[PDB]
């Protein structure tokens, strides 16, 4: 009975990934819903008294790579509560009955450590609409999930069941009834893309301006957040390729701060960068040409059919996440 | 935990197949990307700090028999890291909920032995777009890979997930999002074919010249690397066939080195090669006629519609890897 | 053994018969089946036997577990709210011993009532499922549901099921009373809004509740509850949109108003202490915004499958 | 598993009878013949229209060979699990070679596979290829084990399976003497007044039927007297200690009663006549089609 809690104690993370609300570019409706879900019942407990109850479940859905796990990291950072990060490897067991006793002990620990947050990434693996799947695991896990979510003699009060999935239409109808907040996280718009570029570039010394970031956001038409992250990564790795595949360096302005340039200048010394020791390194600064080359190299991942499926799911049972 | 580690201890290869970067001909973009993402963070760790992060996943795709596993062998040779080589037999198990703990312990061992490189050959078998596959094991192993690659409470820093598949359009969209660099490995051009001929012939005693190698590389149009390897193997096997059909031997020049010729010559000792003992044989030299015979004997492997599908996937969601 | 100390609840959740909006036939059937053998014990003897099996079904989220909570509140009897988690064990034979001792304790604690939520978790139709944990448990439940002569006085089995066509036909025939819980009509919608608002101050009238129930076309009970929750949370969002606060009348009860007014004290909202914030009142516009936000959680395929099931086994 | 049907109980099919007779009797009775290049037949396909005594002839070979028999069917070698419908065939051939010499009877080989055209490709390919490897293979050395296959549709088989089957014997429609002999063995030891010319006229009348059809019309003509005993009134006491016989209502002493008050071992059962068989043949219709005979003609024409 204690080995179950010892196995489930590895699902409570204590690393606290530093993702703040200013790190998330856009998604103001989802951020406001998560704020009124977690920040308010701990900061202002004198408002949720009587017939006013907080939210008891939020389903984040959308295209792959839009920021659902990033909002989960931000909630785990700024929640100041117990965060349960479970998956299909922490609930399914080899024996018989342990696959439901683990879920019962997980919800018992979540109710014992209230206020607590249960984050189940990829809820479509556990809830497979119980029509054709494996009888034992599917039926028992889904029914125990329903009973531990509301049930009769459980009274789940103060816990939050976050869920992030890419396939929202393959959920069970009872699970979709349990998740009382269907929040659609879409692909980012122009202002979100420009703020995401401003966040991902950071304190790197570059000649880019706000008009340059605006033209970059207008260029990335249909990109996702991971695609913006990898074009920022490619544009940041571009000065390393510039300092690798070039010769005829030149000391600019400091203990020989030499920089690659055109062959033939005021001191175009023909040597290699491997002989250059550290801290006499003046790499070329970022321009718009490196980001244009990163845009030309890296291609968008999300197609234009899954967007139609997510749009049909929003018009069927979904809200908007701005 | 310890049983799964004892089962997965036979996955780290300690053989180190001696394939260097000069053994691979062509594929300059794939060479440069693998070179930075393997060599640079373990050789110069002071550069990747702050906003600059290395590549966390590289996917290699193309027609069958182009050099994906050869590039993986070169990475495993020149990586100086704990090279993890898994497939669909080390992860899938018989019991219930034991295939997910295998992948979790594999990624835990990869994080415990960082820097490490995970090479999953034929990723198309594990990931099948989770549309109509076998529900429990398929969807759970896909969601477990998706959680263990980036996830929330994992923070995979230092590991690398290499992929090598022949049919990349059957990959899941979230898995294609995880593989942040799709590198297309095409059929080789004339210089790569000439370099592969010079590498595969190598230190063999032959009278072949640069013009002969150029004519061979111009002749093998549409061939692949395995086809070049087997025509070099047939051209090397042909002097043993000439030794088999070697009536009227002729001892030319030291310590009685026998050499076949036309029937009836100077010193035409008419015998067979069975009674001739070892350590005194002299094989005939390689000409361009044996290689032309091998080219006329062995046909190419890949056809011209699979190349169209690979180019379609490249222009849709990939980059050109030279 | 002693592991069944969690199947019975001692909380008694305060859900009375007036709280259950609508469902008059199911309410009166459960009322007679839980009251009349305790009210008039001479009425049930021999031929005129009471109901020993009650089954509830319909769309998901219509009031099945709510009716079970109402029975557990206004029954005055031992409630056995147990599911498939406390019936299956790692060993062999204990999965039958659990049901045997469960029915033994339920017969010893007469009058009792056993409520099995999601009974399809025990009825996998034994196609190619787990033998020792499916078929033997199903036959044990079939021979322990043979209390038409054994448990004439005492226990009563219940059932709540969202998907009732995937149910074993033997236990379906053993459940003699199968009541279909439908979507609520307009009067049930209006009294459900009246119950869910409750003692919260508002300006909503009976005509406002009637047009709210007319706007909710095809909504369910949980959808009505989360619409009421969103309408309750909307004045907190209006306070969070802090601009030009204004004091009303005791001991500085502030209230935000339109930008530009008489006494528009432009300040923040977190600088003020508690118990002096006169919150705005519930209009109909926040309710209409909650209607436009919240979507119905049920589809048309489940409704036609429920219609097929009730026309096949009404 | 041993039946009790000898060679003489099968009517007609002379070529199939002599072929099976030599192929299963010549090694087991004369071991001094098959030496050197002389090897027995290791496969026989018995096709044709259904109901024409294929399993009856298989039981005749199972009796007269005095060897071990295996009489599995198409549904026995088809499972729902993945890769479990081939280990059954492997264990079948293993237990056949364990008790050599043996006879293997596989029924509905057209329904065992699905000629890998449109059905389940994985299961079809694995079943067919495991059957072929268990038939000849490399290290399977099938000597003395005879694969006796029977089917109703031969043209839906595979080229490799019809190559593995050596002698493709056709079972045709029965003839006049075969029909009369089938009537004579189907009527049994019942008290009858039928003659050889009556059997000849019956067999001339039932041209186009099958063996199962002849069996069910003999069963109908045998059940019709005990049907007319029960479904009749106004019985008649003829002649010796209350011998009762049904007749028309109203006769020379037509006693109207039921069969409940008739004493045991005194009720006169009426003998069956020609009109019962005429009623049976006028009631029963032929079952076979006409294009299947053209398909059998084509199959014999290119695999005679």
């Amino acid at each position: 009975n204690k080995k179950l809690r010892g196995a489930l104690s590895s699902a409570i993370l204590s690393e606290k990934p530093n993702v703040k609300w200013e790190d998330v570019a856009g998604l103001e409706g989802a951020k406001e819903a998560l704020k009124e879900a977690v920040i308010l019942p701990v900061k202002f407990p004198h408002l949720f008294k009587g017939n006013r109850k907080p939210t008891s479940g939020i389903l984040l859905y959308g295209p792959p790579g839009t920021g659902k796990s990033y909002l989960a990291k931000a909630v785990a950072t700024e929640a100041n509560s117990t965060f349960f990060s479970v998956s299909s490897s922490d609930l399914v067991s080899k024996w018989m009955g342990e696959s439901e006793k683990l879920v019962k002990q997980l919800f018992a620990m979540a109710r014992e450590n209230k206020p607590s947050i249960i984050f189940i990434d990829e809820v479509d693996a556990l809830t497979g609409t119980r029509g054709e799947g494996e009888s034992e695991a599917s039926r028992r896990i889904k029914t125990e999930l329903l009973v531990q979510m509301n049930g009769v003699g459980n009274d789940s009060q103060g816990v939050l069941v976050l869920g992030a999935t890419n396939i929202p239409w393959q959920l069970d109808s009872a699970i979709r009834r349990r998740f009382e907040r269907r929040i659609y996280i879409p692909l980012p718009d122009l202002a979100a893309r420009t703020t995401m570029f401003e966040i991902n570039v950071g304190d790197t010394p570059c000649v880019l301006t706000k008009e340059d970031y605006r033209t970059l956001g207008a260029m990335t038409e249909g990109y996702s957040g991971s695609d913006i992250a990898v074009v920022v990564k490619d544009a940041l790795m571009q000065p390393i390729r510039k300092i690798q595949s070039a010769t005829h360096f030149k000391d600019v302005s400091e203990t020989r701060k030499l920089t690659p340039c055109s062959p033939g200048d005021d001191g175009a010394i023909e040597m290699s960068w491997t002989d250059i020791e550290a801290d006499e390194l003046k790499e070329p600064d970022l321009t718009i040409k490196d980001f244009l080359k990163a845009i030309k190299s890296t291609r968008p991942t999300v197609n234009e059919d899954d967007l139609l499926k997510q749009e049909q799911f929003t018009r069927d049972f979904g809200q908007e996440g701005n | 935990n310890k049983k799964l580690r004892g089962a997965l201890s036979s996955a780290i290869l300690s053989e180190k197949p001696n394939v260097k970067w000069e053994d691979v001909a062509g594929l300059e973009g794939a060479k440069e990307a693998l070179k930075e993402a393997v060599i640079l963070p373990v050789k110069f760790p002071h550069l990747f700090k702050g906003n600059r992060k290395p590549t966390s996943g590289i996917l290699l795709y193309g027609p069958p028999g182009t050099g994906k596993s050869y590039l993986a062998k070169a990475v495993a040779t020149e990586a100086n890291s704990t090279f993890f080589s898994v497939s669909s037999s080390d992860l899938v198990s018989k019991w219930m909920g034991e295939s997910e703990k295998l992948v979790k312990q594999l990624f835990a061992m990869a994080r415990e032995n960082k820097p490490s490189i995970i090479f999953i050959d034929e990723v198309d078998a594990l990931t099948g777009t989770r549309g109509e596959g076998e529900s429990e094991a398929s969807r759970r192993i896909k969601t477990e890979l998706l959680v263990q690659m980036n996830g929330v409470g994992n923070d995979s820093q230092g590991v690398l997930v290499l992929g090598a598949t022949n049919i990349p359009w059957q990959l899941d969209s979230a898995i294609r999002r995880r593989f942040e660099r799709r590198i297309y490995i095409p059929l080789p051009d004339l210089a790569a074919r000439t370099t592969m001929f010079e590498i595969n012939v190598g230190d063999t005693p032959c009278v072949l010249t640069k013009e002969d190698y150029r004519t061979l590389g111009a002749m093998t149009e549409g061939y692949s690397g395995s086809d070049i390897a087997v025509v070099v193997k047939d051209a090397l096997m042909q002097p043993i066939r000439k030794i088999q059909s070697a009536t009227h031997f002729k001892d030319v020049s030291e310590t009685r080195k026998l050499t076949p010729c036309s029937p009836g010559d100077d010193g035409a000792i008419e015998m067979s090669w069975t009674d001739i003992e070892a350590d005194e044989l002299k094989e005939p030299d390689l000409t361009i006629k044996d290689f032309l015979k091998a080219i006329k004997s062995t046909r190419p492997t890949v056809n011209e519609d699979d190349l169209l599908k690979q180019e379609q996937f490249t222009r849709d969601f990939g980059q050109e890897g030279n | 053994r002693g592991a069944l100390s969690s199947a019975i609840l001692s909380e008694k959740p305060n859900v009375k018969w007036e709280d259950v909006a609508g469902l008059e036939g199911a309410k009166e059937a459960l009322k007679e089946a839980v009251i009349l053998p305790v009210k008039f014990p001479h009425l049930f003897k021999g031929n005129r036997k009471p109901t020993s099996g009650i089954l509830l079904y319909g769309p998901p989220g219509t009031g099945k577990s709510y009716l079970a909570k109402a029975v557990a509140t206004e029954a005055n009897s031992t409630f056995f709210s147990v599911s498939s988690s406390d019936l299956v064990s790692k060993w062999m034979g204990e999965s039958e011993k659990l049901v045997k001792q469960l029915f033994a304790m339920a017969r010893e604690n007469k009058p009792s009532i056993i409520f099995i939520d999601e009974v399809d978790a025990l009825t996998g139709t034994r196609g190619e499922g787990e033998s020792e944990a499916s078929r033997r448990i199903k036959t044990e439940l079939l021979v322990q549901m043979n209390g038409v002569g054994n448990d004439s006085q005492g226990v009563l089995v219940l059932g709540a099921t969202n998907i009732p066509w995937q149910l074993d036909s033997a236990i379906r025939r053993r459940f003699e009373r199968r009541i279909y819980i439908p979507l609520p009509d307009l009067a049930a919608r209006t009294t459900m809004f009246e119950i869910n608002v409750g003692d919260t101050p508002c300006v909503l009238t009976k005509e406002d509740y009637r047009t709210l129930g007319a706007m909710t076309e095809g909504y369910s009970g949980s959808d009505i509850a989360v619409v009421v929750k969103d309408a309750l949370m909307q004045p907190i969002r209006k306070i969070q949109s802090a601009t030009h606060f204004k004091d009303v009348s005791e001991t500085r009860k502030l209230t935000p108003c339109s930008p530009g007014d008489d006494g528009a004290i432009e300040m923040s909202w977190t600088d003020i202490e508690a118990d002096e914030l006169k919150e705005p009142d519930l209009t109909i516009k926040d309710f209409l915004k909650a209607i436009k936000s919240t979507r119905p959680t049920v589809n048309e395929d489940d409704l036609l499958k429920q219609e097929q099931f009730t026309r096949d086994f009404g | 598993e041993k039946p009790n049907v000898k060679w003489e109980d099968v009517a007609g099919l002379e070529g199939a009878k002599e072929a099976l007779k030599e192929a299963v009797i010549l090694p087991v009775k004369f071991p001094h013949l098959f030496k050197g290049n002389r090897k027995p037949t290791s496969g026989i396909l018995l096709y044709g229209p259904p109901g024409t005594g294929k399993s009856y002839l298989a039981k005749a070979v199972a009796t007269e060979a005095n060897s071990t028999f295996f009489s599995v069917s198409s549904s026995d070698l088809v499972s729902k699990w993945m890769g479990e419908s081939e280990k059954l065939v492997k264990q079948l051939f293993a237990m056949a070679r364990e008790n050599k010499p043996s006879i293997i009877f596989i029924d509905e080989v057209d329904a065992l596979t699905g000629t890998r055209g449109e059905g389940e490709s994985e299961a079809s390919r694995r079943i067919k290829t495991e059957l072929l490897v268990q038939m000849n293979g490399v290290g399977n050395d099938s000597q003395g084990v005879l694969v006796l296959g029977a089917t109703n549709i031969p043209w839906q088989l595979d080229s490799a399976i019809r190559r593995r089957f050596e002698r493709r014997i056709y079972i045709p429609l029965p003839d006049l003497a075969a029909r009369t002999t089938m009537f004579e063995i189907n009527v049994g030891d019942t008290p009858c007044v039928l003659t050889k010319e009556d059997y000849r006229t019956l067999g001339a009348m039932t041209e186009g039927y099958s063996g199962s059809d002849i069996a069910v019309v003999v069963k109908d003509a045998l059940m019709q007297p005990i049907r007319k005993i029960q479904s009749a009134t106004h019985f008649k006491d003829v002649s010796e200690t209350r011998k009762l016989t049904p007749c028309s209502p109203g006769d020379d002493g037509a006693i109207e009663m039921s069969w409940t008050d008739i004493e045991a071992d005194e009720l006169k059962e009426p003998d069956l006549t020609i009109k019962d068989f005429l009623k049976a043949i006028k009631s029963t219709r032929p079952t076979v089609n006409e294009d299947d005979l053209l398909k059998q003609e084509q199959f014999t024409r290119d695999f005679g």
Binding site: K94, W95, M96, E134, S135, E136, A137 | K94, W95, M96, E134, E136, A137 | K90, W91, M92, G93, E128, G129, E130, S131, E132, A133 | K80, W81, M82, G83, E120, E122, A123
Partner: peptide
């Protein structure tokens, strides 16, 4: 008896509980 371990089979899933 002893413990009962759940296994997995393939169709074309289920739970063939092969205990010890």
């Amino acid at each position: 008896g002893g413990d009962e371990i759940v296994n997995k089979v393939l169709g074309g899933x289920x739970x063939x509980x092969x205990x010890x």
